[PDB]
Structures are given as C-alpha cells and as structure tokens.
Amino acid sequence: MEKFVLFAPLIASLIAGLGWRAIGEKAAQYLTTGVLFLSCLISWYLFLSFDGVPRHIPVLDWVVTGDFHAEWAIRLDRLTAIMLIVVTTVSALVHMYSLGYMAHDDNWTHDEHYKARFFAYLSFFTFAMLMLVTADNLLQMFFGWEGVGVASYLLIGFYYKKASANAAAMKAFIVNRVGDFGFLLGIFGIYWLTGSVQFDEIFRQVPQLAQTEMHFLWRDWNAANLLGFLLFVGAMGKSAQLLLHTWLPDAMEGPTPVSALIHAATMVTAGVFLVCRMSPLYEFAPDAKNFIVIIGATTAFFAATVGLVQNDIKRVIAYSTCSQLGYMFVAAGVGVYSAAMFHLLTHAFFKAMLFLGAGSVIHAMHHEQDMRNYGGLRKKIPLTFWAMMIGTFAITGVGIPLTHLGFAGFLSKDAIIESAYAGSGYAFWLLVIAACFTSFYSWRLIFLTFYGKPRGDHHAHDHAHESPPVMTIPLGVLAIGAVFAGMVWYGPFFGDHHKVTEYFHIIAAPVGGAIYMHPDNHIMDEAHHAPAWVKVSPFVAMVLGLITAWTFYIANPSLPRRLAAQQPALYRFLLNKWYFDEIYEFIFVRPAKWLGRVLWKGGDGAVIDGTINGVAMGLIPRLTRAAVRVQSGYLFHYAFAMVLGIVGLLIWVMMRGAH
Template identity: 60%
Template sequence: MYHLIVFLPLIGAIIAGLFGRSIGAKASEYVTSLFLVVAAVLSWVAFFTVALGEGETVRVPVLQWVQSGNLDVDWALRIDTLTAVMLVVVNTVSSLVHIYSIGYMHNDPHRPRFFAYLSLFTFMMLMLVTSDNLLQMFFGWEGVGLASYLLIGFWFKKPSANAAAMKAFIVNRVGDFGFILGIFGIFVLFGAINFDPIFANAADIAQGGGPAVIDLFGMELNSGDALTWVCLLLFLGAMGKSAQFLLHTWLPDAMEGPTPVSALIHAATMVTAGVFLVARMSPIFELSPDALVVVTIVGAITAFFAATVGLVQNDIKRVIAYSTCSQLGYMFVALGIGAYGAAIFHLFTHAFFKALLFLGAGSVIHSVSDEQDMRRMGGLRKHIPMTYWMMIIGTLALTGVGIPFTIIGTAGFFSKDFIIEAAFAAQSPVSAMAFTLLVIAALFTSFYSWRLIFMTFHGKPRASADVMHHVHESPPVMLVPLYILAAGALLAGILFKEFFFGHDYGPFWREALFTLPENQILEDFHHVPGLVALAPFFAMLIGLATAWYFYIRSPETPKRLAREHNGLYKFLLNKWYFDELYDFLFVRPAMRLGAFLWKKGDQATIDGLGPDGIAARVNDITGRLVRLQTGYLYHYAFVMLIGVAALITWMMLGSAFR
C-alpha cells in the first residue's frame, strides 16, 4: 500500500510527461488525477491504521542506496503518525488540485506538461515526508524545489513568471545550503544520517557524551554547542522552504504561476516542508534551548510582519500568500516553544482552509476574465454565490471563528488558539513577545481576510460592464473540490483536536514527535487564564468590525488614512522594502561583480591573453609573413642574393677566426 501511495504520482508524471502528446490532454488529466485520488484514499487508510490505530512505526525498504565508508543509507519509507498526517495532507490537497485544474486549465494548450509537473511535485513531496534519513529527505527537498521552479514558471513566455521562478529557486538555495551543512554536521556528531541512530543518541550527545572537542566547520566546540549549531543550520533550511522572515521574498512572487500551483505550493506541500523538518527533528531541537528560542523569535516576527503587509495588498492572490507566510510563523512559534503537536495540527487544518481560499480565489479570477486586482472587482456575491460561500467558509476558518470554551468552532479556531495559548503558557524566555505578536497578527489576519471578502464580493461592481456581463459561476469540476475542502475547514478542528493536542496526544503521536507528558500538555497549555483564551477571539472581532466599517460602512476612510499616513502606507505596500534592500545589497553588487569579471576577467584577461591573444599573435605574424609572398620574380631574386651574400659573409668570418 505504501509503495502505491508514494509511486502512483510518479507513474502519472511519467505517463503525462513522456506520452502526453500521444494520449492527449484529456487522458493525461484523467490518468494523473485518478492516480492521485487513489493515493489520497490509501493515505486516509494509512492514517486510520497508523495514527488512529495501534500501528507502530513501519519501515518499508525500497532499495539499497549509498554505501561509502561509514555512510550506509538505504532508500526506505518511514511510516509513523507524523508521516501519516503528511500523507493525508499532501495527497488530499494534491488530488483536489488535480481535479480542480481540469476545469481551470481547460483552455491551456500545454495541459499534459502541467499535470506532469503537478504529479512530479507531489511525488517529490512524498519522498520528503516518507524519508527515513536526511539524505533521502534532501532528495525530496531539492525535488520540490525543482518542481516548484517548473510550476511557477509554467507560463514561460511571461517574463514575470520566469523572474518569479528564478527568484524562488535562488532564494531557496540559501536555505538549502544551510540544510546540507546541517546534514554534514549531523554526520560529524552522530556518525550516521539515519533517523533511528540520531534520535537514540541525541540525549547522550547533548550531555557531552560525544568527543570532548569537535571541529565543526572550523570551530572547536563541545558536543552540546555543536548540536545547537547543527539545529540552527537545519532551521536555516526550514526558513528558506517555509518562507520565514528574511527568506520570505520568493513566496508572494510565486503567485505568477497558475492559481492551482499557488494552492498546491502555499497550502499543504512545499511551504510546510520546513515545519515538517523541524517537527521530524524535534528530539534534536528539544535538546537545544537556544535553537528553540531562535525558532520562536523568527516565527513570531514572521507572523507579525506578513500580517502587516497583507493589510494593504490589492492582488487577491498576494493577500492570501502573505496570509500563508503569517500562518507558517504561527507553526514555527509552536515548534519553538515545544508544542510540536499544535504546530502539526495547525499545518493540518491550514491545508484545508488555505487550499480552499486559493482555489476559491482562482474561481473568482476565472469568472472575471483573469483579473486579480480587488480594486477592479466588487459586487460579485450574487453572480458567483457558491464561490462566495466557499470563500466565506475559508475566511471563517482562517480568522478562527468559534465560540470560546465550547467545541463549536472552525478548524482554525482550535489550531490557532492552541498555539496562542501555548505561547502564553510556555517556559520560553521569549514567550511573552511571541504571545503578543501572535495576538496582533490574529487581529490583522481578521482585518485583511474580511477586507478581501468585502472588496471582492460586496459593494458596487468596479469592473467594466463587459467584464461584469461575462461573470459566471465555475463548473462543477472546480466547485466540488471546494466543497470537500470546505468540509475540512469546518470539521477538521472538532474531529481531531484531542488527538493532535489534547487528551489523546500521547497515544496518537507515540514516537513520531518529541512529546511532553500528557498531563503536562493539559496543565501547561490548556489551563490558561480566561482573558488569554479570549484574546484571539476579541482580536478576530475587532478585525472583522474594522474591515466592515472601512469597506462597507465608510469606503472613503481607508483612502483618507492612506493619504494621511502615506509613508506608512507605502512602507507596507512595498513589503517593508525588502526586495529593494536585497536588490541594493546583493543583486546589484552581484551584477557589477559579474560585469567586471566578464569584461576584465573573461574577455580582457583570459580571452585576451589566452585563446584570443594567441590567435591574434599568430594572425599578426602570418599576416606579416604573407607580405613577403608578393609573386614578383625580382623580389625573390633579391632575397636569394641577400641570402647568398649572408652565407658567403658567414663562411668568410668563420675561416678568419679559425
């Protein structure tokens, strides 16, 4: 079963990629989608068998892979509760995106290539989440990077799409460099990169059980300090893939790809890879308090930063993209304070409502002739009512609507509130800062989410009459995936909260995560003051009320505030000027250095003194020699005379000196 779950998407990618032209676009769509649906169904079977059943960790061998000296790595599938959760998330969302894409990409002439890329992306993500060692994880890690490059730049004739694909690829290389250095460090410390020996010896290494002094990247460290550095390097990899603060700039630009790509990358797959990495390595991170503090700080800043930028964005997909960036910050805060189950719970619920929002946004864009600017929408509620209600459900889940102290609430109500409460109760030295930033981010999230709803669906239409005349509801092939995701956005929290971060926490996770004792989870993270538990609820209400007033009651107010606070407005609209800063610090110097090396190094020095220089000298010499070959007899006779004279002179002088 596990082989089918992992390799069916690869088979679909090969069929659509190599034989798509032969079998046709329709066949490519149906084959890849059918394989993903089968993989998704089997993933739910695995979830109920492993996570909700009595199943222990299963190791499924695939083949022998690398054997070199002390390095012995097999390609195997590690199936435990964490893997089962990720299989459900990845394959469920991916299968729905495949089905949705049948309608969304209906008029694209390159559909076989698109579906091949989607399935390849899914396979690489499955390689990542089922890995039994760090090298296998890195293979999947780089694979999703490649596939995301292909998908973001799918419309390769658009310069903006090519630029966005390159940006995503290059920025992720920064994080990937840290990840691979972290893998090297793990091998130095543990002598292995398989998870079982790493986890078994982690506590001993942290307490100095390894070598007295370790030479790690030129630094002489004890094993405990070396472990902290390794964790920080692994987290650097997670920052790149999960678009955390400072390495976040690629994520909004990834919107240049087709909307189903945005849903697949931003909802459940690529951007959650960093969260999965830290969760998988939680037995290591838990032994490094300093690394956990860094994780918490970066996550809290990311949640706040992305939420501030989302307040003023006008592209419907970019608003949701910054929301993704912010929600990933929540997940890393949970990881940093040791609430690993809460982090994966939010990853799980976020997959449903964020995929719902992205696909809903795609349905809106599809209905208004590919327009993405919310300032040119409005009044769409009656024209596309099903899309409207699906977007409402997604927004309710994202903003965490629910009734405090009850079991009534959307998925985000439970998972996000768990993280905020855990941040307050945690023993981390930065927990107060994290709690404050997360509550503020919750307020901003509510504001920009309802701003999107009000600007898109309410008020008077701002699109042209021709566009409004052609507004239409999406076909069932696009709406049915929205219905399924909406059910998850509404019910996932109620159904699974006790397993991920409640009374069944220990039996559910078993050995898949570093788990605190069950009673400590309940005491520390679920028994917080009432005002703390109500904080995200009040933040949600304030954001909703403010958005309603700004965009329904008094639409002139946000325009007036933007004029009065023009500097702040431009600061947020330009995303804190990170793109401009990086362009100044890295891009322009790199271009100047490249131009210098090209002009002075390559052309003037290497080519000038090397191949081009030698060729020029040969041409010069032969050019001069050619001049001697005039073709006139008297020139040749004169040369012969000079030669005879020179020969006689040499002979006479030679005789004189004997």
C-alpha cells in the same frame, strides 16, 4: 500498499507527461487525476488504521560509500500518515479542480497543447512531496526537498511565454537553493558527529550531541544548537520564512491551482514538517528553538502587515500563508510540535479552499486579479461566496470564545497562542497583534469582492457566473474540513497529554516516537492552565479587526483612502512589502553581476591572460627580434662573438684556478 501511494503518481506523470500523444490528452488527465484519488483513499486507510507501530518499507539502496549509506526507503509513523492525507487529499482535489479551471486557457493559442503537461507536473509534484514526507533518512528528505523545488519551478513558470512567470520561477529555485545551502551543511555535520543520516540512529545519539562541542568556521559550537540552526535555514527557505520569503509572493505567476498546492500541501509545509520530524534534536537544542520562535513570530507579524494593503487577491492570500506558517514555527519553538502539526493539518484545508475559492472568482471575472475591480459578486457567485466565507471563518477563528467549539483554525490557533504565552512573551504578543491584522485583511478581502457596489468594468461583472461543478465539488469537500477538522482532531493533537502521547506513540533516548518532547518541557501543560484573558484574546482581536474592516468598507468607505494620506510613508512601506526585494537587488543581484564581469575582464582577461599573452606574445617575440638583430650578416661581428666566447670561458676557468 505504501509503495503504490508513493510511486503511482510518478508513473502516471511519466505516462501522461511523455506519452499523452499516444493516449490523448483526456486519457492523460484522467490517469493522473484518477490515480491520485486512489492513493488518497489508500492514504486515508493508512492514516485511520495506523496502530502506532512505525513501519519501515525498504525500496532500494541509494548512496553507499564506505560507512555512509542512504537508501530509498519508506517510513510510516504518525507524522508520515498525517502528511499523507494532507498531500494526497489536496493534490487529488487540485487535480479535479484543474479539470475545469484549465479546460480552456487564454494563455495558450489553440495550436499549443498544455493540458497533458500540466497534469503531469501536478502528479510529479505530488511524487516529490510524498518522497519527502516518507523519508527514513536525511538524504532522501533532501531529494524530495529539491524535488519540490524543481516541480514548483516547472509549475510557477508554466506560462513560459510570460517573462514575469519565468523570472518568478527562477527566483523560487534560487532562493530555495540558499535555504538548501544550510540544509546541506547540517547533513554534513550530522553524519560526521553520528556516523549516520538515518533518523532513528540520529535520535539515539542526540543526548550525546547536546553535550558535544563541534568546530565550525571560527569557533567551537554546541553541536545540537548548531545543527538545529543549520537544518532550520533549510526550513526557512522552503516555508518562505522571514528574509527568505520574497519567492512566495511571486509564485502567483503560475496558475491558480498551483498556488493552492504550493501554499497548503507540498512546498511551504515542508519546513514545519522537518522541524516536527527532527524534534528529537530540537528538544535538546535550547538555543535553536529560541531562534525559531523569533523568526516564526516576526514572520507572522511581518506577513500580516503587508497583507493589509495588497490589492491583488492571490497576493493577499499569498502573505496569509507566510503569516500562518509563522504561527506553526512559534509552536514548534516553544516545544509543542503536535500543535504545530495540528495547525498545519487544519491550515491545509481552509487555505486550499481560500485559493481554490479565489480561482473561481478570477475564473468567473474573466481573469481579473485586482480587488479594486471586484464589487458586488455575492449574488452572481453564490457557492464561491460561502466557501470563501467559510475559509475566512476558519482562518480568522470564528468560534465560541471560552468553549472548545468552532471552525478549524479557531482551535488550532488558540493552541498556539496559548502555548506562545507559556513559552515566550515576545511570541504571544506578536501573534495576537498579527491575529488582529489577520482579521482585517481577511474580511477586507470579503468586503471588497463579495460586497459593495459592482466596481470596475461592467462587462465581466454582468457576465459573471458560477463555475462548473468540477471546480465547486472540491471546494465543498474542503469545507467539510474547514469546519469539522479542528473539532475532530483537537483531542488527539492538543487536548489531553495522555491522548497526545498515544496518538504520536511518544533522560531516555528520544527514539520510537513520531515526535518527542523533553521531560523538562511542560509548555503544553502551562498552556492548558493559562488564564482566561489568554484564552479569549484571540476572539477579541479577531472581532476587533473585523469591526475595522466593516467600518472601512461598508460604512464610511472613504476612511481607507484618507488614512493613507495622513500616514503616507507607512502606506508605501507596506505596499512595497518592506522593500526586501529592493534591498536584495542592491546587496546581492547587482553586486554578483558586477563581480562576475570584473573577474571575467579584469581577472581572466587583464591579469591572467594579460600575463600569459604578455610573456608568450610580448616577451619571447621581443627576444626573437634581438636574436635576429644580432645576426647582422657582417663577418667581422661573427668573429667578434667567437672571441667573446673564448674570452668569457677563459675568465671562468681562471676563477676556478689551477687546482
């Protein structure tokens, strides 16, 4: 039953991807879309019927060599069941949404066929993420890890005739490879310290790992801290965390349905999930968690400021995902992994809707993506307006301040902000400030597109119309999650310590549970006991950013233009996204190309070949010319040589003496 969920999407993708010609494009699209829905139902049944006893379903042996063994296997615990409904639900919806969004594409000429290929890529992308989240060992986690990398590269560069898409997909693969470099070094370290790559066997040995010193490069390190850091470098790349983030903004070059799947279900959630799946190790690594928070909190702030000034609709939502994933890393760092998963689960719902909502706008607006040309549109697109509004409500966290009643992201974000206060003063303050910036760019997105004077070319504006039901029903189903999901799962994830324990079926060896929390950790409790000025600050900052957005676009709409002129250097800094790309091109790309040409022409050509050719073709021919010259043809010279030979040999015999 679990195997069907895992392997059905792969089989559908193979049939649709390679054999759509035999069975036609339409049968291929329905095969992938239909098979996803069936797995989504099986995922929900697995999720709502889980009794709390993790299951281990073996499939095949992958790599066996001496004492090293990793297997194709399926583990089903609370974490796996959670990720199942998140992956399959959003993937199933994205397949349905794609049936209309890609119905007639302007990127391709009518000769070219793309519909069957696109749906095969989505099914395989689903397969890779499913393989990642059901992993029983660190190696299979890597396969899915690299699997989403190649599926994303296929989909981010779906429009292979667009040089911008081909560069963007290439960038995503390379940057995520930089993350996989640390991941791999963590896997090597774990195997040699514990003799296994299986999660349970690793967790059993974690307490000794915390007291272990491991040599690595120039010094010895606490094993747990080093390994936690090395595995986190992988999570930073996959979740587009700070310093490994530049690939996510450019993933917009792909189709809009791909952005939703990357940003809410498959790619970015992998990093947080790894942190939560590997919590039995991060609980015994005090210093690794410290670094997770600083990265997590700085990313939330960094990605919030950049979203303030971006003008492309998807790139605003692109940075929102990075900032939102900042929050979930703070929660795991402070030691509350249920809250990290809680926000991950709720984030999947309203983030998918926001992207599927923005696809409708782009689809309706004749595929224009610059918000500067998006005025009005509220009456022209009724349902997309409200779905986007609900998405804004959830991400901003519109609720009743001191109660436990509101949209999805209201509850989950408050849990993280409460935990941040108990866990790190650095974390708590950056998050609320980011929470203030979140409200501005979220509502700035609404006012620019769904309000004001119809702004930009009237042709599309007049022709604007609501997209067909196939693109709106998935939005509707998502809305049923971006309102009730937070209230539905608050208790089991964050509400009561006993409630959280049984849900996750959690010094004793940190094994048997979906997550682990060290006994000395009480941040979850201290979050509940936190004062009231903590529990209301998110509502205050959210409102505060809202009023600025209202003040900046409805009333006195010239304030946004004037302020940049007052502080212009700070306008460029945000607009250029803090210049990270330019720094990398200077420090990594250009030097690497220059280094290769120097080694190619200077090393191989001038030093190594220059020497070899210099001897083979310079020296030996020079000795040949001397030999030819000495063969003068004069008889008296040849006799001289014979006499020199005898005289030299006689000198040799004389030095040895009579004896």
